[PDB]
Write a protein that binds this DNA or RNA. Sequence first.
RNA 1: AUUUAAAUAAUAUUUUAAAAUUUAUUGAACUGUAAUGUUACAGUUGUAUGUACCAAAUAAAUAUAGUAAGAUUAUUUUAGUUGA
Lengths: 71, 51, 521, 71, 109, 148, 225, 51, 52
Amino acid sequence: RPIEPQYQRLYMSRLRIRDHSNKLRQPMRLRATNADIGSGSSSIEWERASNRKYGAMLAPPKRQDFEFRVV
Amino acid sequence: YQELHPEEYPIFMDQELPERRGLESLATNPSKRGWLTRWYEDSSKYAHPAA
Amino acid sequence: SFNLPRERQILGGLHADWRTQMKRSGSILNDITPALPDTKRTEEQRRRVAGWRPVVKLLGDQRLRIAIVGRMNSGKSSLFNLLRLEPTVPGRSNVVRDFDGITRDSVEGQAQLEGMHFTIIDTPGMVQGRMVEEAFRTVETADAAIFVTAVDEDIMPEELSLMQYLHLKHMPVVLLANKMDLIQEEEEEAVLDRYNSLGFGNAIPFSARRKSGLEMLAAVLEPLYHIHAMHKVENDWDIEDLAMQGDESAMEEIRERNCSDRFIRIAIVGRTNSGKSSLVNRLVGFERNRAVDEKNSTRDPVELPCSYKGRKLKLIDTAGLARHRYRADRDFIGRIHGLSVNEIRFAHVVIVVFDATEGHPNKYDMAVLHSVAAEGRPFLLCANKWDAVLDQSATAEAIDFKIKRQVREVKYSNAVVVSAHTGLNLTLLMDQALELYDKWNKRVRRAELTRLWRKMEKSVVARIGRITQVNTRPPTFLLQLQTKNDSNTLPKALQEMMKNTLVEEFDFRGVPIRLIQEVKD
Amino acid sequence: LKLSPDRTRNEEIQDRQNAFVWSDEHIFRPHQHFTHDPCSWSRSLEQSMKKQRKLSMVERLRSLEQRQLEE
Amino acid sequence: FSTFALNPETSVAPHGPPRGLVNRYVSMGLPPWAAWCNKVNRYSLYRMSGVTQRSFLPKPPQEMDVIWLNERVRERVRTSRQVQNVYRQLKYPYVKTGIHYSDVLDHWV
Amino acid sequence: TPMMLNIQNMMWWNGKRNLYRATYREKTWYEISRTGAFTKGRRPVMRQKYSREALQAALAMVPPGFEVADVPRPPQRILAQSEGIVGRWYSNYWTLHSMRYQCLLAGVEWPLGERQRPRTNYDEPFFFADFEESKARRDYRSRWINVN
Amino acid sequence: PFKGLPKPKRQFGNEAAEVIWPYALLLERVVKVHPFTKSIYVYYAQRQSTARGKLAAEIARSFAREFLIPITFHNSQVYTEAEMLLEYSETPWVVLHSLDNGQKPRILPVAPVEGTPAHTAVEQLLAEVVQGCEALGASVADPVTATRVLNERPLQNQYVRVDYQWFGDTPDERASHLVRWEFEPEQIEPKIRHRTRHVLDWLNYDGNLPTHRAVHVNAMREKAR
Amino acid sequence: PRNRYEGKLVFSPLRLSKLLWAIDTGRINPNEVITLYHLRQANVVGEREIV
Amino acid sequence: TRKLEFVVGKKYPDAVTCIRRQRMHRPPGTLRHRFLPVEREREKMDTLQHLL
RNA sequence: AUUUAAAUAAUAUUUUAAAAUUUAUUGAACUGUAAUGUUACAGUUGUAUGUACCAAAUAAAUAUAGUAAGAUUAUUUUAGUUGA
Ligand SMILES: Nc1nc2c(ncn2[C@@H]2O[C@H](COP(=O)(O)OP(=O)(O)OP(=O)(O)O)[C@@H](O)[C@H]2O)c(=O)[nH]1
Ligand SMILES: Nc1nc2c(ncn2[C@@H]2O[C@H](COP(=O)(O)OP(=O)(O)OP(=O)(O)O)[C@@H](O)[C@H]2O)c(=O)[nH]1
């Protein structure tokens, strides 16, 4: 059942407060989505960073090497 | 990443197979036309290591 | 040639298994201590135990005695607590856990299945493949035995040896399988076939969680109950016929007066290593319980009926009381502390043991004494290890100083020195306990109370005109206030002074007293 | 509220709810074995729960029986 | 049967730390359960990695009269009963007066 | 102890400094923390790109009776650097495999061998001793069986 | 020393199962056979009339005692057994089964060459047995069903009375010198009242938690002293 | 609810109508086997939605 | 109470109310009260026995 | 996953003032002791006081400034409710 509109407004305000001058900017989502996760990597400075692009953290871990030691 | 940036890989780097979740859901799913359906259905690979 | 030295990967000497790390951590996490093996009894110790004498007579329960035996985690404690039913001491539940050897000492309690009243005994599980001497004694005393086994663990050479021992001793034993809810029909067939081929006979299925087999178990025991009743009545007829001797006449007198009277619950309390188990062993005349140097030697209360000087009673030993600081870290010992407190709350007399080697009772000892006083049980204080303490006079002076410094009725508590190994003043301790119970049940005259109050008023708010003793077991006095203002009660200092006066005059020395402020209406 | 119980509240609830046995709570005539199964879903779930665990005793007995049969 | 027990057929969603995080901790060289920490940032990861030794000696190397081969004073940290606060305490090695006998000197030293 | 007490002793803040620290730190804690610049995650390690003749000369100077399996991968707490052909480069794990990749790119035949030998069928020897307990787990047959 | 393990078969040829096996010997003898192999049964005779028969029986006994328990230990899905028959004979044999119940078991005799050392004879017999197992596994029909049966089959090496000397009793102790990525999140996840508290106590790292006021007071007192 | 745990398969939508519109306009060649790389190069999708 | 009055007022606006404020929320006149203090929770059983 | 949008931008958030507390340091020329004007002892503190505000002095700091308070720079204006 939907939460009370007052509390929903309070939470949406807490999401809005990030950028207040820009009225065109839609409020932040409760849970991050693909576009929000990928925008940072899409930016140019991150566009060059190949290790953080296309959901690198979201994807499951890479297979470790045949021989692996930590000492 | 390799598919989106083939320029950076002059040679076909060994492609790791997906995880167990991927194998169960998509890669080896006849309904989804998983690209590993044929490999999963094969039997010689279970028959002998050589195959 | 080109190789690196072998070396551990995880740094700091840690372990990849949080369970291994937990067991390394220890007490704060694993509160339950491991199984206690049989103690090393020397030849001299055996000789001294043989030389001991029983200061009280242990009574053989006339009802059928049935003992449950088997390996650890076999469901024996669960079956025991399902069968048992205590109408007089609620909260007597044996500790049950998934660990091994949780039951430290043998326990006994009255149980009934289908209107058949008998006494059932739980014994510690096999440890090192050799049951403890207390378990052997209890099994031998018991009239019948139920050997309980689980299905998630195949039979073991320890169980085979126990079965052979029971066969050698000719103990009538019935085989039960207590975890049949974890097994399926096809596997049930095989396990039941193995149990049948064992040699005893058709193993009765049972499941403690499902409470299945209780109705079936009763049918198996009913022949034993009937034959035991026949033997009991035969013994009674023989006693009646041979009463002319005099010893049998005295036995008949005992067996009549025990029914004509009611048992008095004497509960022994103390810290983990006070020596209450040794004290009860000395009192009963042998090592019914087990005493070890380990702090928390026993984890469950034990009750032993017995008669002292022709007065029935049930001597009770408790696990031990620990401070909240320790209990919070180790809740489990907190559980056994709660179990002990439950029995203290229902005892008719309480005896607090404190090791004399310490030199004087501890603050926690005084706390326990005040707790029993508040509960309203005649409290007695006993200094143990008196044969080991060095400065007897200094220890006695310290004990007396502590008692005097105590503020409430505990100030009147009587301290007695008792030694287990040597066995000193045990008869005096029992006599004092009986005297305390008599004072507890003592009665006072209304005229005497009124005259005493009048004299006190002349000797030293709203006055009172009528004082009477309403209750009997805990002596409670009702004092009526000559005012209709419901909040104009008496000062706590005044009521404490009145209680002290009553204790001093009517000899309620080791007995707590209660007062009720009543207003007219 | 229980200080050191072997069974948590959920475990106690499970133990009390599993005490129910339709076999004792009702009767079942032979003709019904071929046309009716009151304990279908619950009994299937119970059998699956039993399968979840693996009993060393029964496994060893079955393995020994199979070894004897092989010869 | 009981509805308070998860059905064997049902599969609850994964909740604990993922294989990626556990692999990061293992690569750092810690047990998998070491992934259970109240809070962790880049600096905390560097601190708990162990590549840097946070120990010391009572006196500088040119003044330490006692023979400390590799033992150093180390502070151990213990959380309170509530995880809100932590207390630290320094620990020193077991200094035993070695009364040895040297063949060359022929006399106990 | 100031560090235990969490006292901010910094020369530019209060003119003080803890006495248990080191006066010179070659690389700050952030530099130590950044591992991608220290390990072989994605970064190339040998910047030299030799020609076919140079690769052949390197393989010639490599001594006989040497296999790639004889050079274990260095642990993670060791800098992943690939020196040139300065000396016995075949000892350096990263330089060896970087030269292997360069030879693969250039079409130069690689005689040293593979890092791991896949044993497809059951052939001699039939019994082997592995006191390190790694060969049995790493066996291709075992991996194949587990996957199946 | 070890309790709860199943009791090994008490045949006259199954002395290896009863004898305690040091872990060093098992590590030295590591034999891998096709897991579709189900059971290996070596059968030899107590006494042999002919000298060649006696040699064959001797090499069969040596092969059993040496490479029978190791096969079971290192496969965990193969039941290996040896039996001595109170009967004259000169042709000891080996019976190989497979997870396919429809597959006829294979019989491999012992055929010693004119003259060779015991070590060479045992090695040749082991090679022949391994080749036979591989051929049987390859010829098994319905390999998918065979693999399912392999998954469903229990471990047959539970009766081996191994003796770990210095490697460690637990698998973690034995593999302490290796990194194990094959962990289960559910198993590793600590399950205790304060798992974070206990983890931080175990490994001395503060979860960015403030120091204790008691510690501050003690430190100030020490500074004063 | 709807927790994006690591390894969860949360695919970004790709409207079949959008793909057909791209083909009709001419940014995607029907004669070739379409792939995510081809879509990216044709610019029918942006880097924001390539997770 | 607040809950009852608000529910009835906001749902049944034309709801009549029958109350005597003088004797509402008070005990009857033929009722006597006795608040007995107890030094500790243990004395409560003895007080109850005395009352009975 | 039957099934309609969009200008990917982030950095900020009055001002003055809490009995503050924290870190480090100095002061026995005043005062209070012991010693015979001088010496020795000092802020989890020396003997009412420790240099004309003893919760001392000096140096550093912008603590839940919030549920203290005060101040807050741009007249000629152009639309809804005045105790719910
Ligand atoms: N499935 C199932 N489990 C049971 C049953 N009865 C007991 N258990 C389990 O067995 C464990 C052992 O508990 P107890 O039988 O009470 O312990 P005990 O009988 O005193 O054995 P010891 O502690 O070694 O002396 C308990 O934690 C229960 O979880 C049963 O009927 N069915
Ligand atoms: N020398 C001596 N020691 C005694 C005496 N009475 C008790 N003890 C001590 O009590 C120890 C045995 O422990 P227990 O008798 O079981 O008493 P406990 O430690 O409290 O055990 P539980 O009450 O069952 O928890 C012995 O090691 C003795 O040191 C005594 O009269 N003389």
